Design a protein around this nucleic acid. Structure first.
Ligand SMILES: [Mg+2]
Ligand SMILES: [Mg+2]
Ligand SMILES: [Mg+2]
Ligand SMILES: [Mg+2]
Ligand SMILES: [Mg+2]
Ligand SMILES: [Mg+2]
Ligand SMILES: [Mg+2]
Ligand SMILES: [Mg+2]
Ligand SMILES: [Mg+2]
Ligand SMILES: [Mg+2]
Ligand SMILES: [Mg+2]
Ligand SMILES: [Mg+2]
Ligand SMILES: [Mg+2]
Ligand SMILES: [Mg+2]
Ligand SMILES: [Mg+2]
Ligand SMILES: [Mg+2]
Ligand SMILES: [Mg+2]
Ligand SMILES: [Mg+2]
Ligand SMILES: [Mg+2]
Ligand SMILES: [Mg+2]
Ligand SMILES: [Mg+2]
Ligand SMILES: [Mg+2]
Ligand SMILES: [Mg+2]
Ligand SMILES: [Mg+2]
Ligand SMILES: [Mg+2]
Ligand SMILES: [Mg+2]
Ligand SMILES: [Mg+2]
Ligand SMILES: [Mg+2]
Ligand SMILES: [Mg+2]
Ligand SMILES: [Mg+2]
Ligand SMILES: [Mg+2]
Ligand SMILES: [Mg+2]
Ligand SMILES: [Mg+2]
Ligand SMILES: [Mg+2]
Ligand SMILES: [Mg+2]
Ligand SMILES: [Mg+2]
Ligand SMILES: [Mg+2]
Ligand SMILES: [Mg+2]
Ligand SMILES: [Mg+2]
Ligand SMILES: [Mg+2]
Ligand SMILES: [Mg+2]
Ligand SMILES: [Mg+2]
Ligand SMILES: [Mg+2]
Ligand SMILES: [Mg+2]
Ligand SMILES: [Mg+2]
Ligand SMILES: [Mg+2]
Ligand SMILES: [Mg+2]
Ligand SMILES: [Mg+2]
Ligand SMILES: [Mg+2]
Ligand SMILES: [Mg+2]
Ligand SMILES: [Mg+2]
Ligand SMILES: [Mg+2]
Ligand SMILES: [Mg+2]
Ligand SMILES: [Mg+2]
Ligand SMILES: [Mg+2]
Ligand SMILES: [Mg+2]
Ligand SMILES: [Mg+2]
Ligand SMILES: [Mg+2]
Ligand SMILES: [Mg+2]
Ligand SMILES: [Mg+2]
Ligand SMILES: [Mg+2]
Ligand SMILES: [Mg+2]
Ligand SMILES: [Mg+2]
Ligand SMILES: [Mg+2]
Ligand SMILES: [Mg+2]
Ligand SMILES: [Mg+2]
Ligand SMILES: [Mg+2]
Ligand SMILES: [Mg+2]
Ligand SMILES: [Mg+2]
Ligand SMILES: [Mg+2]
Ligand SMILES: [Mg+2]
Ligand SMILES: [Mg+2]
Ligand SMILES: [Mg+2]
Ligand SMILES: [Mg+2]
Ligand SMILES: [Mg+2]
Ligand SMILES: [Mg+2]
Ligand SMILES: [Mg+2]
Ligand SMILES: [Mg+2]
Ligand SMILES: [Mg+2]
Ligand SMILES: [Mg+2]
Ligand SMILES: [Mg+2]
Ligand SMILES: [Mg+2]
Ligand SMILES: [Mg+2]
Ligand SMILES: [Mg+2]
Ligand SMILES: [Mg+2]
Ligand SMILES: [Mg+2]
Ligand SMILES: [Mg+2]
Ligand SMILES: [Mg+2]
Ligand SMILES: [Mg+2]
Ligand SMILES: [Mg+2]
Ligand SMILES: [Mg+2]
Ligand SMILES: [Mg+2]
Ligand SMILES: [Mg+2]
Ligand SMILES: [Mg+2]
Ligand SMILES: [Mg+2]
Ligand SMILES: [Mg+2]
Ligand SMILES: [Mg+2]
Ligand SMILES: [Mg+2]
Ligand SMILES: [Mg+2]
Ligand SMILES: [Mg+2]
Ligand SMILES: [Mg+2]
Ligand SMILES: [Mg+2]
Ligand SMILES: [Mg+2]
Ligand SMILES: [Mg+2]
Ligand SMILES: [Mg+2]
Ligand SMILES: [Mg+2]
Ligand SMILES: [Mg+2]
Ligand SMILES: [Mg+2]
Ligand SMILES: [Mg+2]
Ligand SMILES: [Mg+2]
Ligand SMILES: [Mg+2]
Ligand SMILES: [Mg+2]
Ligand SMILES: [Mg+2]
Ligand SMILES: [Mg+2]
Ligand SMILES: [Mg+2]
Ligand SMILES: [Mg+2]
Ligand SMILES: [Mg+2]
Ligand SMILES: [Mg+2]
Ligand SMILES: [Mg+2]
Ligand SMILES: [Mg+2]
Ligand SMILES: [Mg+2]
Ligand SMILES: [Mg+2]
Ligand SMILES: [Mg+2]
Ligand SMILES: [Mg+2]
Ligand SMILES: [Mg+2]
Ligand SMILES: [Mg+2]
Ligand SMILES: [Mg+2]
Ligand SMILES: [Mg+2]
Ligand SMILES: [Mg+2]
Ligand SMILES: [Mg+2]
Ligand SMILES: [Mg+2]
Ligand SMILES: [Mg+2]
Ligand SMILES: [Mg+2]
Ligand SMILES: [Mg+2]
Ligand SMILES: [Mg+2]
Ligand SMILES: [Mg+2]
Ligand SMILES: [Mg+2]
Ligand SMILES: [Mg+2]
Ligand SMILES: [Mg+2]
Ligand SMILES: [Mg+2]
Ligand SMILES: [Mg+2]
Ligand SMILES: [Mg+2]
Ligand SMILES: [Mg+2]
Ligand SMILES: [Mg+2]
Ligand SMILES: [Mg+2]
Ligand SMILES: [Mg+2]
Ligand SMILES: [Mg+2]
Ligand SMILES: [Mg+2]
Ligand SMILES: [Mg+2]
Ligand SMILES: [Mg+2]
Ligand SMILES: [Mg+2]
Ligand SMILES: [Mg+2]
Ligand SMILES: [Mg+2]
Ligand SMILES: [Mg+2]
Ligand SMILES: [Mg+2]
Ligand SMILES: [Mg+2]
Ligand SMILES: [Mg+2]
Ligand SMILES: [Mg+2]
Ligand SMILES: [Mg+2]
Ligand SMILES: [Mg+2]
Ligand SMILES: [Mg+2]
Ligand SMILES: [Mg+2]
Ligand SMILES: [Mg+2]
Ligand SMILES: [Mg+2]
Ligand SMILES: [Mg+2]
Ligand SMILES: [Mg+2]
Ligand SMILES: [Mg+2]
Ligand SMILES: [Mg+2]
Ligand SMILES: [Mg+2]
Ligand SMILES: [Mg+2]
Ligand SMILES: [Mg+2]
Ligand SMILES: [Mg+2]
Ligand SMILES: [Mg+2]
Ligand SMILES: [Mg+2]
Ligand SMILES: [Mg+2]
Ligand SMILES: [Mg+2]
Ligand SMILES: [Mg+2]
Ligand SMILES: [Mg+2]
Ligand SMILES: [Mg+2]
Ligand SMILES: [Mg+2]
Ligand SMILES: [Mg+2]
Ligand SMILES: [Mg+2]
Ligand SMILES: [Mg+2]
Ligand SMILES: [Mg+2]
Ligand SMILES: [Mg+2]
Ligand SMILES: [Mg+2]
Ligand SMILES: [Mg+2]
Ligand SMILES: [Mg+2]
Ligand SMILES: [Mg+2]
Ligand SMILES: [Mg+2]
Ligand SMILES: [Mg+2]
Ligand SMILES: [Mg+2]
Ligand SMILES: [Mg+2]
Ligand SMILES: [Mg+2]
Ligand SMILES: [Mg+2]
Ligand SMILES: [Mg+2]
Ligand SMILES: [Mg+2]
Ligand SMILES: [Mg+2]
Ligand SMILES: [Mg+2]
Ligand SMILES: [Mg+2]
Ligand SMILES: [Mg+2]
Ligand SMILES: [Mg+2]
Ligand SMILES: [Mg+2]
Ligand SMILES: [Mg+2]
Ligand SMILES: [Mg+2]
Ligand SMILES: [Mg+2]
Ligand SMILES: [Mg+2]
Ligand SMILES: [Zn+2]
Lengths: 118, 59, 131, 122, 16, 204
RNA sequence: CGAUGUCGGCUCGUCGCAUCCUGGGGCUGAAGAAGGUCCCAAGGGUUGGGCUGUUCGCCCAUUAAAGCGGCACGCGAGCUGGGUUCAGAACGUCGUGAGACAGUUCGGUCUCUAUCCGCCACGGGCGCAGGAGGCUUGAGGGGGGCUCUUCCUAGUACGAGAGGACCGGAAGGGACGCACCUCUGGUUUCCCAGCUGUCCCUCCAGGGGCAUAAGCUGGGUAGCCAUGUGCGGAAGGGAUAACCGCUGAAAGCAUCUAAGCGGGAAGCCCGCCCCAAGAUGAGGCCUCCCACGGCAGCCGGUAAGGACCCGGGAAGACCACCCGGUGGAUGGGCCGGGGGUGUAAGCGCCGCGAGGCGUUGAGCCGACCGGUCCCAAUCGUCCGAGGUCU
RNA sequence: GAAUGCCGGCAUGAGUAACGAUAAAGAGGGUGAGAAUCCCUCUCGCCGUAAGCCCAAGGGUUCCUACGCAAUGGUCGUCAG
RNA sequence: CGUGAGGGAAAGGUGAAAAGAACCCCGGGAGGGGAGUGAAAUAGAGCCUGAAACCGUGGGCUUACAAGCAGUCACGGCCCC
């Protein structure tokens, strides 16, 4: 049973799942857009939305929290100075997931892009 | 355990009746409203990069 | 519909607001209506609250005392109609929400771990200045 | 939740210090005894020259337990030990003092004599 | 009730 | 033989005569009668009740016609109560008074594919003393050559839950008509949010 | 004998009835209570422990009772492996010996993959002469079926006394079943905190990895749960068993019987709860579509409707089921509440310092109860009647 | 037509068990007909009395480079002993 | 294969002649389709003949209330000559 449980497991134990999201966060905030598997993309949305929202708060506390996940002082700076400001008036939903048409050859995995919104 | 094993060879009739559920269903496809190329619904069009009436992607 | 609101609605008739706020670590006296022969009477139960489970109307709290050489714990519903009153007899400062560790501490050891919550005592005297 | 094998403190002055439950007297197959229930016990440890001695098979009513007991008024009470008072076949204590508190539940079950002798009832 | 055993204790199959 | 449809909203307890009373709260009213079943027409007696209002955008044509013939706005659920013929065009919690005893039907929580220990309270195997990969296994399922088969009905692993369950003879603790609330003492099948049926009890 | 694994235990039952208990009854050397003995009865129940490999048995403590048998001495492709059938070793004993024993003793390889029948669950197909969306009847099945204590009647009937009822009525349990999570009590793999060692970011402060597949510790929401909570066994109707009769011949009397009629069990049938029209004997009711083209047949476009696809779900292995798809609160985000943790960082102050104090119930914050179109369920596609004959 | 015959071929079980340590991955860029699997970058994890380095046996061209991917590689392959 | 003594296989056939398929087309290639050779190319090199088991495509008849060592006898339906 899984009744009203929230969170995918993605066939990773606790520390790997976590590193998986953090690394995907870095990737998304770095490039503005990445491609992955649909379920990974769907989990990313929230993990990153929170960091974008914390960046919108702007305070030092907020910076030090974001930095637990993102680690890169420069990256966070970009997040704080370039990314957060485009979302000042946007209330949540800073990321979007659109599904790709073609599956990956080697394993038939369905793909999707995840990207920061306008 | 004690190593179970088929008692009789399965007849061609039986084998093939097991396969009565094996036919693939064809991909469900809808036209891309921009470039009319056939594609999966809910996907960004891989011919033209369009989805929700806009250009999403270089193709 | 709003299932939560409906439940709060059922509960609103039983809620109480006359009882004082207290924290785990505080020492407290619960005057509790209690039934015997053939009467009901009020028995006081005084001790450290070692736990407060919250769930709105359903929050409960547990009070521990030593009685004639034996440890006793009582669990009370915070909104129980059987509580006549609660008196704060002392404020303790805990660093933990749940104080089950005091079950294995000596009397000396407890007193050292739960010092007077000097802030909330002063705060208690600041009120109790009436008009 | 006392069961055969459970050791109980004895809270009286019969000379027994510790008893091991060997049966819960509550019908044909009760699994557990709580407050107010009678068990049969073995005396596992006693002080010299008391009314009762090691080896004796006695009866006792459980008077406080480490598993909390719940009450119709929504509360529960829990003691630090499991303790029992040794009785005779008419539910009367065989000792003359009882030490420590006992559960009010004892009264509704007709262990009136024990309930009074007790320093506290919770 | 104990009686004569009629087989030896079996071992798992030797590889064929 | 009165009855009503409702949703289970959740549990709490109330205090009644210095007693904690465990309760499940059900939203029951109001239930528009949308067809009556009669002996002449249908061969037996009952009332088809509707419950919760629906978006007309979601009600197809054969359904709409059914509602229309009753002059009843569209509703999410239709369920009959048997041998019940209320006077009004509408059934509400008022058909129950505190103290009455009721039976509630729900669809129980679904456990999916369940093991024999969860489903049938089987004992399982030992956890040591040599138990080999059989800790939660059923044991024997039969005899030998006679009868050489397994009884129909033999308790085995399989789906468990998400089934119709009726719990019987529950006390009605309160009814709160202004909110269509029925407070029933005890436990009612199913999740919060699930549909239930509240009938007058068949116990005496 | 080109193998039908062999004791006991565990697990899981199921049946018999020569009945251990519970229900009904006749006789009693049956006053009462309690027994004995036989008859009817298989619905349910039939405890935990010490010894021993034991089955059996004895014993302790209870019980309404602690039944006896069958199912390959039920059940090793279900587990065990203490006993027993290998090889080692030793005692007693027998044998010159090698060795031996319907003796003893310590040790001693128990095989991942289920084809078919059967069983538990779930679908897919077709059918049920028009096609559809709902709601149902219940043929027929299955589930359940135990029982004790106290109190009143009444210290009455009975009895010299001890003792102590029938009938009728209350209350409270044990074990078991189904459901549930308000309480109680668990878990809660990252929801919060504390802590050590080490490497790292960025020197301080603050942090991150690793120490488990949580490094360790203290806690812990939803969920799933029992040790927790509710509820069940009936009532009631019907027909019977033994057994007791009414009326009553044959057989002027008598007779429960030959005609007829009554009473009478925990058992039987119904009643309760669940499945159930593949019940091909394919039931019924409500509503919707329609008498379309080309040639009980075919080909094509539609109708009511359905599926596909998508967002999901206390539904779920896939499948199915249920909800929703911008005419939108379905999930994600964001917001508010709840809930956990238990007073963040930063700064100020006190202290040589470890620290302390204030800002501050702060900060952080899964799932719960809700709001909000910020993100995404875009856009669409394909099936689908035209109703055989009397 | 049978010898659990002999040699060979082809079935069945079955799209089933498995794909060989639970140290672990993610993304961007390149190349190519083709890319989860080759190259490069950044991030993440694992070993570190080793899962690093040097010798001796044994092995025998497996070394380096270019051009290749039928087969070998438990998948893929543009890569490779 | 075995340390070794020693054990010890499988594996023949285009056509009279290579005339062994220039060139074009699809394809990364393999493979194929045309063109061409030949009396013949289902003699195209995975080559004479090319059985059987085994796998498939197409068609006729048949089958979703039925009980089976699978046939046999009878009748009837449909399809073919
Ligand atoms: Mg699980
Ligand atoms: Mg959810
Ligand atoms: Mg999940
Ligand atoms: Mg997570
Ligand atoms: Mg996996
Ligand atoms: Mg992985
Ligand atoms: Mg894990
Ligand atoms: Mg890790
Ligand atoms: Mg770790
Ligand atoms: Mg969130
Ligand atoms: Mg998409
Ligand atoms: Mg797709
Ligand atoms: Mg590939
Ligand atoms: Mg086996
Ligand atoms: Mg097996
Ligand atoms: Mg094994
Ligand atoms: Mg096997
Ligand atoms: Mg076989
Ligand atoms: Mg075959
Ligand atoms: Mg075939
Ligand atoms: Mg088959
Ligand atoms: Mg709630
Ligand atoms: Mg007192
Ligand atoms: Mg002694
Ligand atoms: Mg063998
Ligand atoms: Mg009918
Ligand atoms: Mg329902
Ligand atoms: Mg489920
Ligand atoms: Mg199990
Ligand atoms: Mg169960
Ligand atoms: Mg259980
Ligand atoms: Mg067990
Ligand atoms: Mg167990
Ligand atoms: Mg065991
Ligand atoms: Mg073993
Ligand atoms: Mg194991
Ligand atoms: Mg056997
Ligand atoms: Mg048979
Ligand atoms: Mg189901
Ligand atoms: Mg009330
Ligand atoms: Mg629920
Ligand atoms: Mg033999
Ligand atoms: Mg054989
Ligand atoms: Mg054999
Ligand atoms: Mg056999
Ligand atoms: Mg038996
Ligand atoms: Mg008999
Ligand atoms: Mg009797
Ligand atoms: Mg008598
Ligand atoms: Mg007598
Ligand atoms: Mg008798
Ligand atoms: Mg019986
Ligand atoms: Mg039976
Ligand atoms: Mg029996
Ligand atoms: Mg012992
Ligand atoms: Mg034993
Ligand atoms: Mg024994
Ligand atoms: Mg014996
Ligand atoms: Mg008796
Ligand atoms: Mg016994
Ligand atoms: Mg046997
Ligand atoms: Mg025999
Ligand atoms: Mg037996
Ligand atoms: Mg056996
Ligand atoms: Mg075995
Ligand atoms: Mg055995
Ligand atoms: Mg067997
Ligand atoms: Mg076997
Ligand atoms: Mg078997
Ligand atoms: Mg077998
Ligand atoms: Mg087993
Ligand atoms: Mg042995
Ligand atoms: Mg032994
Ligand atoms: Mg022996
Ligand atoms: Mg041998
Ligand atoms: Mg030996
Ligand atoms: Mg031996
Ligand atoms: Mg010896
Ligand atoms: Mg000798
Ligand atoms: Mg001898
Ligand atoms: Mg001799
Ligand atoms: Mg000699
Ligand atoms: Mg011999
Ligand atoms: Mg010996
Ligand atoms: Mg050993
Ligand atoms: Mg031995
Ligand atoms: Mg084994
Ligand atoms: Mg099978
Ligand atoms: Mg078979
Ligand atoms: Mg079906
Ligand atoms: Mg179907
Ligand atoms: Mg029936
Ligand atoms: Mg049938
Ligand atoms: Mg009296
Ligand atoms: Mg009862
Ligand atoms: Mg809760
Ligand atoms: Mg809880
Ligand atoms: Mg709780
Ligand atoms: Mg709790
Ligand atoms: Mg964390
Ligand atoms: Mg560190
Ligand atoms: Mg530092
Ligand atoms: Mg590291
Ligand atoms: Mg490391
Ligand atoms: Mg460890
Ligand atoms: Mg690790
Ligand atoms: Mg950690
Ligand atoms: Mg520690
Ligand atoms: Mg805890
Ligand atoms: Mg913990
Ligand atoms: Mg929880
Ligand atoms: Mg329980
Ligand atoms: Mg009960
Ligand atoms: Mg009856
Ligand atoms: Mg009768
Ligand atoms: Mg007479
Ligand atoms: Mg007469
Ligand atoms: Mg006569
Ligand atoms: Mg007659
Ligand atoms: Mg009669
Ligand atoms: Mg009579
Ligand atoms: Mg009964
Ligand atoms: Mg039904
Ligand atoms: Mg039907
Ligand atoms: Mg039906
Ligand atoms: Mg039939
Ligand atoms: Mg029908
Ligand atoms: Mg879906
Ligand atoms: Mg799903
Ligand atoms: Mg839909
Ligand atoms: Mg749409
Ligand atoms: Mg939503
Ligand atoms: Mg939302
Ligand atoms: Mg929130
Ligand atoms: Mg809050
Ligand atoms: Mg709070
Ligand atoms: Mg502070
Ligand atoms: Mg601070
Ligand atoms: Mg200073
Ligand atoms: Mg909040
Ligand atoms: Mg709105
Ligand atoms: Mg389209
Ligand atoms: Mg022959
Ligand atoms: Mg063979
Ligand atoms: Mg063979
Ligand atoms: Mg052969
Ligand atoms: Mg041959
Ligand atoms: Mg051969
Ligand atoms: Mg062969
Ligand atoms: Mg094969
Ligand atoms: Mg498969
Ligand atoms: Mg298989
Ligand atoms: Mg499988
Ligand atoms: Mg397999
Ligand atoms: Mg392998
Ligand atoms: Mg697998
Ligand atoms: Mg591998
Ligand atoms: Mg692997
Ligand atoms: Mg491991
Ligand atoms: Mg890449
Ligand atoms: Mg790329
Ligand atoms: Mg690749
Ligand atoms: Mg590739
Ligand atoms: Mg790899
Ligand atoms: Mg590389
Ligand atoms: Mg290490
Ligand atoms: Mg080192
Ligand atoms: Mg070599
Ligand atoms: Mg070479
Ligand atoms: Mg070199
Ligand atoms: Mg080379
Ligand atoms: Mg190389
Ligand atoms: Mg190269
Ligand atoms: Mg290759
Ligand atoms: Mg390749
Ligand atoms: Mg290739
Ligand atoms: Mg080559
Ligand atoms: Mg290969
Ligand atoms: Mg390969
Ligand atoms: Mg390999
Ligand atoms: Mg290449
Ligand atoms: Mg290589
Ligand atoms: Mg050799
Ligand atoms: Mg060699
Ligand atoms: Mg040789
Ligand atoms: Mg040869
Ligand atoms: Mg030639
Ligand atoms: Mg030649
Ligand atoms: Mg020629
Ligand atoms: Mg080309
Ligand atoms: Mg070519
Ligand atoms: Mg071609
Ligand atoms: Mg060619
Ligand atoms: Mg020619
Ligand atoms: Mg010629
Ligand atoms: Mg030819
Ligand atoms: Mg030829
Ligand atoms: Mg050939
Ligand atoms: Mg020739
Ligand atoms: Mg040829
Ligand atoms: Mg050929
Ligand atoms: Mg052929
Ligand atoms: Mg064919
Ligand atoms: Mg039939
Ligand atoms: Mg037919
Ligand atoms: Mg025939
Ligand atoms: Mg004929
Ligand atoms: Zn397009």
């Amino acid at each position: 049973m899984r009744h009203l449980k929230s969170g995918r497991k993605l066939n990773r134990h606790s520390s790997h799942r976590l590193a998986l999201y953090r690394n995907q966060a870095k990737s998304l905030l770095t490039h503005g857009r990445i491609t992955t598997t649909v379920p990974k993309a769907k989990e990313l949305r929230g993990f990153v939305d929170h960091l974008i929202h914390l960046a919108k708060r702007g305070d030092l506390h907020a910076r030090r929290l974001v930095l637990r996940d993102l680690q890169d002082v420069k990256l966070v700076r970009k997040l704080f100075d370039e990314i957060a400001p485009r979302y000042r008036d946007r209330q949540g939903g800073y990321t979007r997931v659109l599904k790709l048409a073609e599956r990956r050859r080697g394993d038939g995995a369905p793909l999707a892009l995840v990207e920061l919104v306008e | 355990a004690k190593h179970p094993v088929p008692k009789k060879k399965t007849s061609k009739a039986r084998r093939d009746a097991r396969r009565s559920h094996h036919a693939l269903t064809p991909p469900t496809l809808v036209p891309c409203p921009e470039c009319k190329a056939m594609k999966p619904p809910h996907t960004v069009c891989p011919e033209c990069g369009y989805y929700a009436g806009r250009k999403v992607l270089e193709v | 519909m709003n299932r939560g609101a409906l439940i709060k609605l059922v509960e609103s008739r039983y809620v109480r607001t006359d009882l004082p706020e207290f924290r785990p670590g505080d020492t407290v006296r619960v005057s509790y209506k209690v039934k015997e022969g053939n009467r009901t009477r009020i028995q006081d139960f005084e001790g450290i609250v070692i736990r407060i489970r919250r769930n709105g109307f359903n929050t409960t709290f547990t009070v521990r005392k030593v009685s004639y050489g034996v440890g006793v714990e009582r669990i009370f519903p915070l909104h129980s109609p059987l509580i006549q009153k609660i008196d704060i007899v002392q404020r303790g400062r805990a660093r933990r929400a749940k104080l089950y560790f005091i079950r294995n501490l000596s009397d000396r050891e407890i007193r050292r771990k739960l010092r007077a919550d000097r802030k909330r005592i002063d705060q208690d005297r600041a009120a109790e200045r009436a008009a | 939740m006392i069961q055969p094998q459970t050791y109980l403190e004895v809270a009286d002055n019969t000379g027994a210090r510790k008893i091991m439950c060997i049966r819960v007297l509550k019908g044909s197959n009760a699994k557990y005894a709580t407050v107010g229930d009678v068990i049969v016990a073995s005396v596992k440890e006693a002080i010299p020259r008391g009314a009762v001695k090691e080896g004796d098979v006695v009866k006792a009513v459980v008077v406080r337990t480490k598993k909390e007991i719940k009450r119709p008024d929504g509360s529960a009470i829990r003691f630090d030990d499991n303790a029992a008072v040794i009785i005779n076949n008419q539910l009367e204590p065989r000792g003359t003092r009882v030490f420590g508190p006992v559960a009010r539940e004892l009264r509704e079950k007709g262990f009136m004599k024990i309930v009074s002798l007790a320093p506290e009832v919770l | 009730v104990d009686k004569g055993s009629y087989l030896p204790r079996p071992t798992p199959p030797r590889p064929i | 033989m009165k009855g009503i449809l409702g949703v289970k909203v959740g549990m709490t307890r109330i205090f009644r005569d210095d007693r904690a009373v465990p309760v499940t709260v059900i939203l029951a009213g109001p239930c528009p009668v949308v067809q009556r079943r009669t002996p002449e027409k249908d061969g037996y007696t009952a009332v088809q009740l509707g419950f919760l209002p629906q978006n007309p955008k979601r009600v197809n044509r054969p359904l709409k016609g059914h509602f229309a013939k009753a002059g009843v706005e569209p509703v999410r659920i239709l369920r009959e109560i048997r041998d019940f013929n209320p006077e009004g065009d509408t059934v509400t919690v008022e058909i129950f008074k505190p103290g009455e005893r009721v039976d509630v039907t729900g669809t129980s929580k679904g456990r999916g594919f369940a093991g024999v220990m969860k489903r049938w309270n089987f004992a399982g195997g030992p956890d040591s003393h040599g138990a080999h990969k059989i800790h939660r296994h059923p044991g024997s399922i039969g005899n030998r050559k006679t009868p050489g088969r397994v009884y129909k009905g033999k308790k085995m692993a399989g789906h468990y839950g998400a089934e119709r369950v009726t719990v019987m003879n529950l006390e009605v603790v309160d009814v709160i008509p202004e909110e269509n609330l029925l407070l029933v003492k005890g436990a009612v099948p199913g999740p919060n949010g699930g549909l239930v049926i509240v009938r007058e009890t068949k116990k005496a």
